[PDB]
Amino acid sequence: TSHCRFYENKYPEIDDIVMVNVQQIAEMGAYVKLLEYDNIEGMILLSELSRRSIQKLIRVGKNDVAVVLRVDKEKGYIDLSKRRVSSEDIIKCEEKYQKSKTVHSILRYCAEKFQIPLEELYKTIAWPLSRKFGHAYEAFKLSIIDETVWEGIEPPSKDVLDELKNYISVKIRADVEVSCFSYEGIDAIKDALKSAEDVKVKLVAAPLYVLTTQALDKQKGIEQLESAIEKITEVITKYGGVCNIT
Template sequence: MTRFYENKYPEVDQLVMVQVQSIEDMGAYVKLLEYDGVEGMILLSELSRRRIRSVQKLIRVGRNEVVVVMRVDPEKGYIDLSKRRVSAEEVVKCEEQYEKGRAVDSILTQVAKRRNVSTESLYEQIAWPLHSKYGHSYEAFKLSIQEPEAVFGSLGIDADTLVELKHTIARRLTPKPVKVRADIEVKCFDYQGIEAIRRALKAGEALSTEEVPIKVRLVAPPLYVMSTTSTDKTAAIDTMEKAVAAITASIEKEKGDVVVKMAPKVVSETDDAELKALMEQFEQANMDVAGDDDSEEED
């Protein structure tokens, strides 16, 4: 276990991730996962805002918990913690921070092993200075994928370690593309219904960006599938939701409607395989319906 941050102990009011070691009469003994496993305690009175009927329902040995620091006595090594003073929003914030720390720790541990040096020495030379400069060394590591000299240039890292560090960061932190899909039924029984559907689908595709290219394909009337592949999951889902809204607005002007069978979400290879099998069944029937033109061919 290593210390993620330069300070040996956390500060009062700081959120920290702990792992429960034991439960005693006074409270729960825990180790602070980001601070080299230093010991702390959550008093029973600080476990919950409500009356405690069963400690085991609130906290269990071996489980990770987000807590806030109440008191720190560096001389005696006492750290008093509270679980009940932590809000749901703070739990999410701390979990995100902890995962960033774990990612950095994993990278440095790997580099240390390959270079036969201590992980702590890499923290001292690399992670702690970057944490101070960028708010978190994780953010610096991500930036280094595009701007390695700007991030690492002033740290005096030896050439072999720098090569190993950049390689490990690129392998661990380069965003992986995800596929986002939405299934929609588009109907319009007006006289110009086919053209109305075509225009509506084009309105959705028009919201494509370089980072989030949208394609619309026919499965079988009236079912269409929208899809995109992007390294930015949040932007992909957001853009797809806007595309569905654009299609809906367009077709409703033509007295048609849209039924969302599956809202935009990240799909797996299994989901894609099932969709492909379904589309192949209809392709055998040689269906040629509005919206299934050359620009909407399958990837």
């Protein structure tokens, strides 16, 4: 289920910047939904959303840039403004929206795996990460280099935490064509296996060896595969045979 606000409190304030995904058009303005501050409706009027004929502008398509004017903290009524946001601030509005969208993507694997509500998981994360650290994206960037933010609050789900770390972190296929014509070769292939595995190396046929090299940041698999080619060439030159690598 997709709910719960990005911030701590339900309703916005004055001067705070948001990003809206347009839902309707014409007459008043647009009763919609937000991608920066909750999924409830927050209305704007045609005047605000014009500045600068118009029908071609957005009309419930992608995303814009708006600033909250009037908030009702009783039942739920939000007013916005598109014009007011300055050109220098627009780039900052887009980056906060990108930060909010990454936080929402992070807090969705947790609800899928352990079959528990998303609002409870959003509440337990947004206390040391969102309130004390600054933002949840930079706290996640700190946790992947050296775990220091995650160690504060104790997690009831550790298997979800391992699944999320695996998602932040892919096998690249490699085939070796062994065609040895030497006196001793079995001990050589065993020596080449002990240097490359210690990722997953399997046997399919007598000449062909299938090995999948794991990559953390995708480009890491190339450097380790090239090291594996260098280690295979060093092994077979001494015994008296040839190993062809693709």
